[PDB]
Write a protein that binds this ligand. Structure first.
Ligand code: HEM
Length: 154
């Protein structure tokens, strides 16, 4: 809800390792999301036809969308909570057009933490994880509040 400066530094330090391979991370993240919560796949008319993990990894458009996710997320994270203006378009499209429940944001948050562990086994320790979890939570809580402001959910 409020991150210390240290936690924000941890988040941005970790995020710089995402930005080193945005496509790899975004692809993995979407794949983990889709494998651990298949219900989220059917939200994607572009991808709902992808079943095996090998198929999803061969989907360039899935990779492209991973980039879109993470670049949008990274722009938000870099604001260190001052992401009001960056969230509204995301909240708007995910509440009203995509109809994404906040719970689905929790699933992708888990998929982010998981993927960061499997791509950075020595770089993503307990502190960095706590910091990243708090950042994604704040993100999810603020998105929740922006849903409510658009008159949606919860
Ligand atoms: C960190 C969390 C997330 C971020 C930053 C994010 C970001 C974005 C962005 C930038 C777009 C493109 C512009 C737009 O449509 O608003 C998009 C589209 C979309 N998002 Fe998300 N998203 C997140 C979580 C999710 C989750 C968890 C789901 C569903 C389970 C989802 C479903 C969709 C869908 C269906 C689209 C349209 C896809 C398409 O047009 O092919 N999003 N998202």
């Amino acid at each position: 809800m409020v991150l210390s400066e240290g936690e924000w530094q941890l988040v941005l330090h970790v995020w710089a390792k995402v930005e080193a391979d945005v496509a790899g991370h975004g692809q993995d993240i979407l794949i983990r999301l889709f494998k651990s919560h298949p219900e989220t796949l059917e939200k994607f008319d572009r991808f709902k036809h992808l079943k095996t993990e090998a198929e999803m990894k061969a989907s360039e458009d899935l990779k492209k969308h991973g980039v879109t996710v993470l670049t949008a997320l990274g722009a938000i994270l870099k604001k260190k909570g001052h992401h009001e203006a960056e969230l509204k378009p995301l909240a708007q499209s995910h509440a009203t057009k995509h109809k994404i429940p906040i719970k689905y944001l929790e699933f992708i948050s888990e998929a982010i933490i998981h993927v960061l562990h499997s791509r950075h086994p020595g770089d993503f320790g307990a502190d960095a994880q706590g910091a990243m979890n708090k950042a994604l939570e704040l993100f999810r809580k603020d998105i929740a509040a922006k849903y409510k402001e658009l008159g949606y959910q919860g």
